Design a protein around this ligand. Sequence first.
Ligand SMILES: Cc1cc2nc3c(=O)[nH]c(=O)nc-3n(C[C@H](O)[C@H](O)[C@H](O)COP(=O)(O)O)c2cc1C
Ligand code: SF4
Ligand code: SF4
Ligand code: SF4
Ligand code: SF4
Ligand code: SF4
Ligand code: FES
Ligand code: FES
Lengths: 40, 87, 209, 428, 106, 258
Amino acid sequence: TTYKNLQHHDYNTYTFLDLNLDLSKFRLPQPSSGRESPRH
Amino acid sequence: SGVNNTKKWKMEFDTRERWENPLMGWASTADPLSNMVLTFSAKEDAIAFAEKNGWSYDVEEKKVPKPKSKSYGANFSWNKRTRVSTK
Amino acid sequence: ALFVHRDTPENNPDTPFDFTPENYKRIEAIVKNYPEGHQAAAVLPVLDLAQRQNGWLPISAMNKVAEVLQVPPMRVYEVATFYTMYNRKPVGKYHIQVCTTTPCMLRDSDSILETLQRKLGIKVGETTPDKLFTLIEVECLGACVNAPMVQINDNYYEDLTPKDIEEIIDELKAGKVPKPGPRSGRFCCEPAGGLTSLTEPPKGPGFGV
Amino acid sequence: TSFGSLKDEDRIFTNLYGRHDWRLKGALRRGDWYKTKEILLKGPDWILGEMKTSGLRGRGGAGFPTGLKWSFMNKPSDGRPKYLVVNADEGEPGTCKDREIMRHDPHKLVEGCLVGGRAMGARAAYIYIRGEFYNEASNLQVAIREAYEAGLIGKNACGSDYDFDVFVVRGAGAYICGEETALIESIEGKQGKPRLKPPFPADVGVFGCPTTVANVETVAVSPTICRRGGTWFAGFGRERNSGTKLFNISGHVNHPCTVEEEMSVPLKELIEKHAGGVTGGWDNLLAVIPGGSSTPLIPKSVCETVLMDFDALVQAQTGLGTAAVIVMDRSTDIVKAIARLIEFYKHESCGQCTPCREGVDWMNKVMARFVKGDARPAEIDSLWEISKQIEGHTICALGDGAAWPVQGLIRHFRPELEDRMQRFAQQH
Amino acid sequence: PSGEERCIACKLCEAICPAQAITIEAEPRADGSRRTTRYDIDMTKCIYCGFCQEACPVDAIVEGPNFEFSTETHEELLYNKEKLLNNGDKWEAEIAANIQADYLYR
Amino acid sequence: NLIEVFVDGQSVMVEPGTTVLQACEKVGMQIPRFCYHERLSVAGNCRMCLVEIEKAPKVVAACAMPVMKGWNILTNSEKSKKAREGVMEFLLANHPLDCPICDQGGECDLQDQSMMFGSDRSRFLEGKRAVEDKNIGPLVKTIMTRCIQCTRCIRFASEIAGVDDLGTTGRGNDMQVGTYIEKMFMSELSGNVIDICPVGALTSKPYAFTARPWETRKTESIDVMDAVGSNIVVSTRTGEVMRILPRMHEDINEEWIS
Ligand SMILES: Cc1cc2nc3c(=O)[nH]c(=O)nc-3n(C[C@H](O)[C@H](O)[C@H](O)COP(=O)(O)O)c2cc1C
Ligand code: SF4
Ligand code: SF4
Ligand code: SF4
Ligand code: SF4
Ligand code: SF4
Ligand code: FES
Ligand code: FES
């Protein structure tokens, strides 16, 4: 019929980072290493 | 990063004085045993050679390298501080 | 590029770079996305977000990313000089980058770069005097079965002619973003006449379990 | 057994050309999240057994046997969490078969991340996308937003007792971050330089934590290898190499397409039946590259009787990676084509090994001299010798993929190089 | 051929000189380049063998075809650097013709 | 916890967690090295160490492999010697020819490996890359044209010097090593970067051009002026103090000096 991916025209340049902002409240509590850094 | 100088024992002398030549600043010396290095294969044979020639010896033992625990899997750890940030 | 810094007054570490508070909330969203152990995983998308904040990534931003994420700045510059998406030269607003490698080239990418040169006035890699378009001869951008393709900013414009350039550039200069997608009668990368697959309507839930 | 049909009921990559509702609530219409709860509650070893009995192999440039590759770590917990990594990078030229499943069904990729991640035993799957794949990453996180709002990922893995995370990690534009370990160092946040393999990624992967690296097909035909096949997927293809493949037919053809078909189909059928024939007919169609860039050439003398198996192309002196059927014709420049391959490898290659720092650049300089012809024919076999000096002498297989079309060009198109040496020997 | 003393302190010409007749202790020139402070050629030593002119990678040391350089006192055959440099400056019209007629042979 | 390892038919019992280099060092055969210092971390970059591993068709690197069980490392084989001559040919493809310029005349670790392990005649007729020199300090003179990108300096500055300043910028032959901005790399232990560097790319600036290591005579001493008491090779030329170098004793100073 007709091509249905219409939102790929409509995505702004901040869109994927904005959905990372939306999904970071949906993410699990991330694993901890016992260390705050590799101390580079 | 070689081994082939470290493999055999050697026998150098006490370094005496080496003054400047008054003509053009050459290394002028009066010690003809200063250029002497003698190769060997064992510490016992080198000590027996120094006893059979009569010079007093200073013997320094062979400083062999201890083999390290070098593993590539420990370069990328989950908790340890030995992570490499270059690659 | 040149892969070294020559401390010019347009690229000194006193150029004005500071994130917005919603950008810093986005930085800690990236930090909470990654695990808390090894939080030097956030060199690439944080500096990519700096590139999305502004192009021509200065050394104040390359020290700002290290200042926020507590990475060494040389370990930041390793990423920012290894990766080809990160622009350190002064680049334009629209930033046309065109493939010239081989499946993407054998259907006529030499002519699309040549008509880009004849339309713009750039030899290989410099800028327009209005700083609108810069051309970078990139190697591969993925989308090759649509056989000519260009990349304006963050969109794919693909399977197109110099006659299609005659509306795409002429609407980019004097208009908005001109419908990112493949031209010349195809929809994504379909057959030019007909369809090979997806001709029957698609299968059911658990079809053939 | 002369298969290669793949009739329209048994398509495995439906919603690929755009139509019929690519989002969630249209993805569940076409078969997604249907028996996934009982798939996860039946057991991870049952999913790995249905991988091994299907005989799914690596759909990237390696061709490693999956099932075995995911049972490299069918391990109990060592303290570290476990991760599944998805090479959403494509990088090899001609290969947007992963871009066409980024669009139009990323929910199958998300379901494959969840099914393959609980099949290995894991916590998160990291879909690492290319830095020029912005709309693809946005469609991926639209599908991740729909799955997390439906409650399919995260503390109820399609309503089960399992916690999972699905991330999108964006790169910044190199093919080498599609490798199995420069993938890992790119996600760890460094230069995209591949690690040495004598520590495997199954023992230490991203962040020190053990990982399984898989391509987009390699995880995305997995959630319908277990709700739909296991023996049906093994019945397609031969015994060593089995399944379906997104064939990517590009270059000098009237219909450039991505057609998903049954693997080990004839290449005559891949030219003529689906993605209709090349310009001119069959006086053309010399110099077909069967895969993307890590496969050597074919001189059209044996190409009429080519089966598309991995070991059959090994017996036909090539490999098969991503299966991008790049077709040249007689109106090409084959030396300019393969010098543009080594120009891609020189302007792309990560710079870690000695025979890819100064070996790939050597092959680029000698083949750029071979374009103009201003060399002598005594260096063709020496450039063959340095191509064989690159091959097994590198860290990753970018040295393999850079020195292999060199070996194809010298193995099949040596008299065209001798003709160009004669053409420059005419001049003065 | 455009000024500029050719010697660049390599020290392979006394590792090949079998009389041990060459001392060439050097410094950076404080101009960015690389030259020698001292040359010493002992003419009361040395073997007249052409080992140095075959080991010189830039052909700075050369053995110009004099033989009329007999001196009366022993000081005057200890050629340091300035005697060698104005010797080659004295004989550059003949040495360069010999090297230009001879460099296909070696 | 011992592994029976064959090195050309030997019977060496080596502990697990080892390398092929640390297996062969008990034999006495030295597999050639540029990227691997003994006291730095393993990072296979230079690819000189390639040996064959008894009839597996891929030659493997001696830095990364643990010897598993009963492997025979054929150190003097046709495939390993072809690998070493090929990797030396590829190292000397884009090496600019400043060996009479260079500080490491006899102390070049790659002159000796090309002299004993590489081929005879290079077939390179194309053109070498040239790298812009840096301004790291008044101690470390960096002519980075002849750098072989072996990353032995950046692991020292990242792991033992702890400065995090030397890392690689770029890719391919355009990958160059050093500070990306004009940074004065001047910490303590910044002179051990020179002796770690097997090439004469970065060398000493006060010992720039004054002597040569075959001409110098190498005596031994202990340090003063810091109370750690390190073993020092004093290399003297004609009764003049020319170099001070570290000397290996694994307690007091393990090939470093300040
Ligand atoms: C040099 C190199 C580059 C690769 N690039 C990609 C890539 O961009 N995309 C991809 O999906 N696989 C890529 N692969 C393949 C995967 O790393 C590998 O095949 C993996 O096992 C996934 O395939 P499988 O699912 O059949 O196991 C690459 C492999 C190599 C060695
Ligand atoms: S083969 Fe090339 S791309 Fe792969 S690790 Fe070596 S230098 Fe990097
Ligand atoms: S005379 Fe020649 S070999 Fe000797 S130091 Fe001078 S330039 Fe080098
Ligand atoms: S010719 Fe004289 S200066 Fe030259 S190496 Fe022979 S003996 Fe020495
Ligand atoms: S480091 Fe390079 S320039 Fe110096 S002697 Fe060795 S090969 Fe020659
Ligand atoms: S400067 Fe020296 S140590 Fe550093 S990468 Fe180059 S050759 Fe290796
Ligand atoms: S090579 Fe052109 S984008 Fe693929
Ligand atoms: S010595 Fe092993 S790769 Fe360098």
